[PDB]
Structure formats: structure tokens, C-alpha cells
Design an enzyme around this catalytic site. Structure first.
Site, PDB file in Angstrom:
ATOM      1  N   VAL A 271       1.960   7.041   0.894  1.00  0.00           N
ATOM      2  CA  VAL A 271       1.178   6.004   1.493  1.00  0.00           C
ATOM      3  C   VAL A 271      -0.398   6.185   1.224  1.00  0.00           C
ATOM      4  O   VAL A 271      -1.007   7.254   1.169  1.00  0.00           O
ATOM      5  CB  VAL A 271       1.240   6.335   2.928  1.00  0.00           C
ATOM      6  CG1 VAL A 271       0.404   5.449   3.688  1.00  0.00           C
ATOM      7  CG2 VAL A 271       2.766   6.499   3.560  1.00  0.00           C
ATOM      8  N   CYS A 272      -0.787   4.917   0.792  1.00  0.00           N
ATOM      9  CA  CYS A 272      -2.193   4.760   0.372  1.00  0.00           C
ATOM     10  C   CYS A 272      -3.027   4.216   1.692  1.00  0.00           C
ATOM     11  O   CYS A 272      -2.611   3.188   2.139  1.00  0.00           O
ATOM     12  CB  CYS A 272      -2.309   3.805  -0.834  1.00  0.00           C
ATOM     13  SG  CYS A 272      -4.021   3.795  -1.437  1.00  0.00           S
ATOM     14  N   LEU A 273      -3.824   5.006   2.261  1.00  0.00           N
ATOM     15  CA  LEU A 273      -4.398   4.890   3.580  1.00  0.00           C
ATOM     16  C   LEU A 273      -5.725   5.632   3.335  1.00  0.00           C
ATOM     17  O   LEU A 273      -5.677   6.827   3.287  1.00  0.00           O
ATOM     18  CB  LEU A 273      -3.604   4.977   4.586  1.00  0.00           C
ATOM     19  CG  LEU A 273      -4.057   4.826   6.062  1.00  0.00           C
ATOM     20  CD1 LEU A 273      -4.289   3.388   6.185  1.00  0.00           C
ATOM     21  CD2 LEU A 273      -3.055   5.335   7.102  1.00  0.00           C
TER      22      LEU A 273
ATOM     23  N   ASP B 206      -6.874  -2.454  -1.593  1.00  0.00           N
ATOM     24  CA  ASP B 206      -6.344  -1.181  -2.296  1.00  0.00           C
ATOM     25  C   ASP B 206      -4.663  -1.115  -2.540  1.00  0.00           C
ATOM     26  O   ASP B 206      -3.779  -0.428  -2.029  1.00  0.00           O
ATOM     27  CB  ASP B 206      -6.619   0.082  -1.640  1.00  0.00           C
ATOM     28  CG  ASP B 206      -6.100   0.683  -0.497  1.00  0.00           C
ATOM     29  OD1 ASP B 206      -5.212   1.186  -0.337  1.00  0.00           O
ATOM     30  OD2 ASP B 206      -6.733  -0.092   0.532  1.00  0.00           O
TER      31      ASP B 206
ATOM     32  N   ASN C 226       0.858  -1.103   0.029  1.00  0.00           N
ATOM     33  CA  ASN C 226       0.081   0.098  -0.010  1.00  0.00           C
ATOM     34  C   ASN C 226       1.008   1.049   0.177  1.00  0.00           C
ATOM     35  O   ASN C 226       0.482   2.269   0.343  1.00  0.00           O
ATOM     36  CB  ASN C 226      -0.947   0.010   1.127  1.00  0.00           C
ATOM     37  CG  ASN C 226      -1.758  -1.212   1.467  1.00  0.00           C
ATOM     38  OD1 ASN C 226      -1.744  -2.023   2.270  1.00  0.00           O
ATOM     39  ND2 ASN C 226      -2.605  -1.645   0.516  1.00  0.00           N
TER      40      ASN C 226
END
Ligand SMILES: Oc1ccccc1-c1ccccc1O
Length: 156
Positions: free
Chosen positions: A91-93, A126, A84
Site C-alpha cells: 500500500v502506498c499511503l 501518487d 495506490n
């Protein structure tokens, strides 16, 4: 941005008073040497007892003028192997996207603890980077081996 700068001063005060052990979060400086609350240099320690243990992972937190309407952009520097984390380091969050789970009340401490949690528990729905995601899905032993090598590389 008066609104952003006022909130960031509050965040800095709160962080300095009480923060999780091993974490770092410090504003950077402008060319004239003054404090730049819009750009923070941070570090997240790997959780003990996990493949991330012993690593200290540096990341930059970048705030927009409309903060806290918007979440900061959080970017690992250098980029990290993790399903992620984009190849750019970003950062993908969900809490870091305005129209997902970001709320203006979320604190810098909550963000850094959220990213630490993400490190050891990827969200397979994701994917942000092909390689770490593919390995995580295909061979968990190989995945953790790669994570341990990375933690050693980023040991203080
Ligand atoms: O070197 C550090 C030590 C501690 C905390 C952050 C950094 C850092 C974080 C992002 C970018 C550059 C940096 O130096």
C-alpha cells in the site's frame, strides 16, 4: 526489540478492547507456536454504499525492529486493483512513509481505517500501479465496474 514488542502488546490490547466492526487484526505465530507480534494478519471490509461494499480484503502488516520509529509495511494478499496499491500488494499511503506523514503515535486502528478510506478515495498524485490508475483517470464507470467485480470476488 523490547521497545517494539512493548508497543505492539499495547496495540493488541487496545485493538481487542475497541475496534471498528468487520475489521480483523491478529498477530501470527512463530514456528514454535509462540505469538509473533511483528507480523499481523488483517482484514478490511469494504465500506457500505461504495463499490467496495461486501468485500473483505486481506492484508499483512509487517513491523520492523525499530517500530514505532518506522511505519509497518502493509501488503494486500492477494494484490488488489487500486491506483495506490503496488502490483506487489504493498500500500502506498502518506501515513505509511517515515519521511512523509508517519508519526510514531499512529495506531493500528488508525492505519487500517486510513487504508479503508484510501480504498474508496484514490490519490491520483501518487500512482502505484499503471492499470488501475489509467482506468480511474480515463473512465470512472469502468473503474467502478472493476472494483465491484473485485469486491464480489473477495466476499466472505
Ligand atoms: O485469512 C485472513 C482472515 C482474517 C484476517 C486476515 C487474514 C489473512 C491476512 C493476510 C494474509 C493471510 C491471511 O490469512
Amino acid at each position: 526489540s523490547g521497545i517494539a514488542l512493548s508497543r505492539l502488546a499495547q496495540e493488541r490490547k487496545a485493538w481487542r478492547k475497541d475496534h471498528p466492526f468487520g475489521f480483523v487484526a491478529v498477530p501470527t505465530k512463530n514456528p514454535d507456536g509462540t505469538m509473533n507480534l511483528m507480523n499481523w494478519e488483517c482484514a478490511i471490509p469494504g465500506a457500505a454504499g461504495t463499490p467496495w461494499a461486501g468485500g473483505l480484503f486481506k492484508l499483512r502488516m509487517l513491523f520492523k525492529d525499530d517500530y514505532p520509529s518506522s511505519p509497518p509495511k502493509c501488503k494486500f494478499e492477494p494484490p488488489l486493483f487500486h491506483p495506490n496499491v503496488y502490483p506487489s500488494g504493498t500500500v502506498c499511503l502518506s501515513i505509511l512513509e517515515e519521511d512523509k506523514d508517519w508519526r510514531p503515535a499512529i495506531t493500528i486502528k488508525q492505519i487500517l481505517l486510513g487504508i479503508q478510506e484510501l480504498l474508496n478515495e484514490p490519490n491520483i498524485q501518487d500512482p502505484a500501479q499503471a492499470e488501475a490508475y489509467t482506468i480511474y483517470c480515463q473512465n470512472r464507470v469502468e473503474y467502478e465496474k472493476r472494483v465491484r467485480a473485485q469486491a464480489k470476488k473477495f466476499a466472505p
